[PDB]
Amino acid sequence: AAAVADRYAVYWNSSNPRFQRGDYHIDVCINDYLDVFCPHYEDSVPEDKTERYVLYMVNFDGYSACDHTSKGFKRWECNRPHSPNGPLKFSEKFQLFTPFSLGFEFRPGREYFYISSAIPDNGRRSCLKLKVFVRPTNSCM
Amino acid sequence: PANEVTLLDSRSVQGELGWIASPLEGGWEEVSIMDEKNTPIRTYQVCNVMEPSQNNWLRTDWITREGAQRVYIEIKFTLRDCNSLPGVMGTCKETFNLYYYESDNDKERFIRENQFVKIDTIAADESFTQVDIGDRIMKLNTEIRDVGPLSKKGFYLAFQDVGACIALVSVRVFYKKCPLTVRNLAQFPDTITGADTSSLVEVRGSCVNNSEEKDVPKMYCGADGEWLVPIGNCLCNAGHEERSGECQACKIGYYKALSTDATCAKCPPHSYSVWEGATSCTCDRGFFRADNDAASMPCTRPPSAPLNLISNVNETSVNLEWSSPQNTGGRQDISYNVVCKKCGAGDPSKCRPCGSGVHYTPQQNGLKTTKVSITDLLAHTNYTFEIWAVNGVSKYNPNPDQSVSVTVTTNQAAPSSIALVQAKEVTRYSVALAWLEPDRPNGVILEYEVKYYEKDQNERSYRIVRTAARNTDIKGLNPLTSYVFHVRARTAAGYGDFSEPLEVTTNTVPSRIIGD
Ligand SMILES: *[C@@H]1O[C@H](CO)[C@@H](O[C@@H]2O[C@H](CO)[C@@H](O)[C@H](O)[C@H]2NC(C)=O)[C@H](O)[C@H]1NC(C)=O
Ligand SMILES: *[C@@H]1O[C@H](CO)[C@@H](O[C@@H]2O[C@H](CO)[C@@H](O)[C@H](O)[C@H]2NC(C)=O)[C@H](O)[C@H]1NC(C)=O
Ligand SMILES: *[C@@H]1O[C@H](CO)[C@@H](O)[C@H](O)[C@H]1NC(C)=O
């Protein structure tokens, strides 16, 4: 395939080591994509023998404490573990300007944060989380 | 709504919507977003407002048209102001192009480069700005366009971006139909609209279970999915009424006689319907309806006996008068019949019918008033009368207590003549007479009167003798002399006619009273 732009892929389950010390982070350039994949299972699996969560984009202070409340914005629902064709996919473009009114904007050299709450609803002091650093233009071009 | 049928819904394509973008990268891009409904959804967006020339295509899957000919497209989107995009001088646009093409090939893999046909240029009514992002105002546009008449199994839709900054929130594609409905007790099927937005489709209806067609049921289907002004109707069969859009059977205790009747009514007085769907009511026990009839009209009964039977009598004539019964049943067709009889010590009802050439004025039968005058009958017999209270029924239940009887004893008049007077013994000075009772006494005979005189007009003396017995001895007469005798009878009404003259001449036979 063609590209100018890169896509970072991220599998969000708790099986995923990159999450372990709660320090998963990526460096992206502007107009790159991040693709978070949801946990997705075999048809023959009970929907409660199953990991599901809600993804939230939150500031530093709520990156620290695993807390979305009054911190950021709901972004995705990973609740559909038997998703018809592949896992449920959240795409994020790290663009300067949104064509969507209630979309999201990103500046170079700034840094951005994602966390999640489960559908098991447990109040966690512990959550799977992601820091994204959007590089300076002079590491990109 | 109930009149729109979806052929495509981007939000509803839960199995992920697979559309061809050309270019596959750097043009329309699918990107995750929270909608007006707060659902997380994939949508396409493009924002390449800084390049000199842009040509970005996004094309849907093949969309089967079903049977529709006029298809609507409703696009929800957001478009950003070129003012709010910094330093975009020359190239930024605020519109996008909308295309379709028809095809029976559902697996055309590659966006056609020629064959697409422009539906419209779509502009926004609420272009958005930095502030809206700031405050989380989602200025969401809706535009609808429509295409057709469509002829192939399916079509594709496309969107071309030439330099706007835009986000397609939803695409929904549909056609319109007039929904299944019942009008004037005819059923009309789901009907797809016609080829143009001004097309009417004529639809013939089917009479609902269970009803009959009056005028052929028809209705027109409007382009906007509203049924237009109908013509024709069906009527609910007898025993059924219209409720909702059905002909339901009449409730217990209710009936409907003809289809041309409005609704069910309840059974009128003294009739009942024990079954649902009743076209008639079965009259109650002892009740009936005349040949001149309406099943609407209540059932009635034979009346009671007429009242205050009041008799007047003249010598050989009875005048009668009575009053309306206690219970008429009831109806205005009450009449009376008079019945004559003859009895006496025969209390047992041993009464020959008297049938004769009597009247009976004015009628004797089917009588409307409460009076009747009987004439031309025999003097000293006990007649019996029955007066019968009748109506339009009672031919269906007759009975002697619908009548009251007067046994009446007639008046008396002066008797007939005797006809037979005989001389039993003749002496020189006496005539012994004997006679029979007159044929018609016409009453109680009180006495008899004998009138006699000499046959010769010269020296003639008229003499009279009275008696209770049917015989007498006229004494003291001239011997060898011819006499004439007449006899008459008397009742309280007067004298009968004198008998035919009896001529008797005294002889010379010695009187034994005289002796020696
Ligand atoms: C859990 O996440 C793991 C990785 O952390 C997923 O594993 C990847 O699955 C993809 C897509 O099928 C493969 O292409 C990768 O190579 C896999 N990596 C590994 C290490 O196996 C895994 O599928 C996720 N699964 C569920 C069910 O949540
Ligand atoms: C008409 O009717 C009566 C019977 O109802 C006849 O005789 C009557 O008999 C009763 C005694 O049982 C007496 O009072 C009288 O002798 C009669 N009744 C009346 C009211 O006078 C009677 O003879 C009949 N008349 C004729 C002409 O046949
Ligand atoms: C008896 O009455 C009838 C009818 O009213 C009448 O014609 C008849 O002359 C009457 N006889 C009399 C009054 O003696």
Instruction: Kindly determine whether residue A93 and residue B167, on different chains, have CB atoms separated by under 8 Å.
Output: no
List the CATH number of the domain containing B380: 2.60.40.10
Q: Whats the size of chain B, residue-wise?
A: 516
- How many A/B residue pairs have CB atoms within 8 Å? 86
Ligand nearest to the CA of B493: 3
> Does residue A39 contact residue A79 with C-beta atoms inside 8 Å?
no
Technique of determination: X-ray
Instruction: Kindly determine whether residue A3 and residue B79, on different chains, have CB atoms separated by under 8 Å.
Output: no
Q: Count up the domains in chain A and report the number.
A: 1
Q: Count up the domains in chain B and report the number.
A: 5
Q: Are residues B37 and B160 in the same domain?
A: yes
Chain B contact for A141 (CB, 8 A cutoff):
no
Neighbour tally for B273: CB within 10 Å: 22
DSSP B305-364: --EEEEEEEETTEEEEEEE--S---S-TT-EEEEEEEE-SS-TTT------SS-EEES-S
- Position B226, amino acid: E
Q: Are residues B354 and B375 in the same domain?
A: yes
Instruction: Of B240, B188, B190, give the one whose Cα is nearest residue B211.
Output: B240
What is the DSSP pairing of strand A7-11 with strand A33-37? Answer: parallel
Neighbour tally for B266: CB within 10 Å: 13
Q: Are residues B515 and B456 in the same domain?
A: yes
The token duo for B418 is: 């005797």
DSSP B126-193: S-B-HHHHHHT----EEEEEEE----SSEEEEEEEESS-EEEEEEEEEEEEEEPPEEETTEEE--EE-
Residue A56 and residue A53: Cα distance in Å, rounded?
A: 10
What is the DSSP pairing of strand A25-28 with strand A129-134? Answer: parallel
The position carrying tokens 């009056």 is B214
Residue B412 and residue B314: Cα distance in Å, rounded?
A: 9
Q: Are residues B17 and B123 in the same domain?
A: yes
Q: Are residues B420 and B435 in the same domain?
A: yes
Last residue of a domain, one of B347, B378, B411: B411
B457: left (phi over 0), alpha (psi -120 to 50) or beta: alpha
Give B206's strand partners: B187
List the CATH number of the domain containing A96: 2.60.40.420
Q: How far apart are the first and last CA of chain B?
A: 152
CA A39 to ligand 1: nearest atom: 28
Backbone angles phi, psi at A17, to 5 degrees: -45, -25
Residue B105 and residue B113: Cα distance in Å, rounded?
A: 16
> Does residue A117 contact residue A58 with C-beta atoms inside 8 Å?
no
Q: Are residues B290 and B352 in the same domain?
A: no
Counting Cα atoms < 13 Å in the Cβ hemisphere of B376 gives 7
Instruction: Of B6, B304, B300, B43, give the one whose Cα is nearest residue B159.
Output: B43
A3: chain B residues, CB-CB within 8 Å = 25
Cα angle B347-B352-B355, degrees, rounded to a multiple of 5: 140
> Does residue B45 contact residue B163 with C-beta atoms inside 8 Å?
no
Could you tell me the residue range of the domain that residue A133 belongs to?
1-141
Q: Look at residue B448 and give its three-state secondary structure.
A: strand
Last residue of a domain, one of B384, B411, B438: B411
Q: Are residues B364 and B402 in the same domain?
A: yes
A95: chain B residues, CB-CB within 8 Å = 47
Q: How far is the CA of A34 from the CAs of A94, A129, A133, B440, B483, in angstroms?
A: 8, 14, 12, 144, 171
The nearest CA of chain A is from the CA of B175 a distance in Å of 28
Query: How much distance in Å is there from the Cα of B313 to the middle of ligand 3?
Result: 10
Last residue of a domain, one of B254, B271, B301: B301
Residue A114 and residue B34: Cα distance in Å, rounded?
A: 16
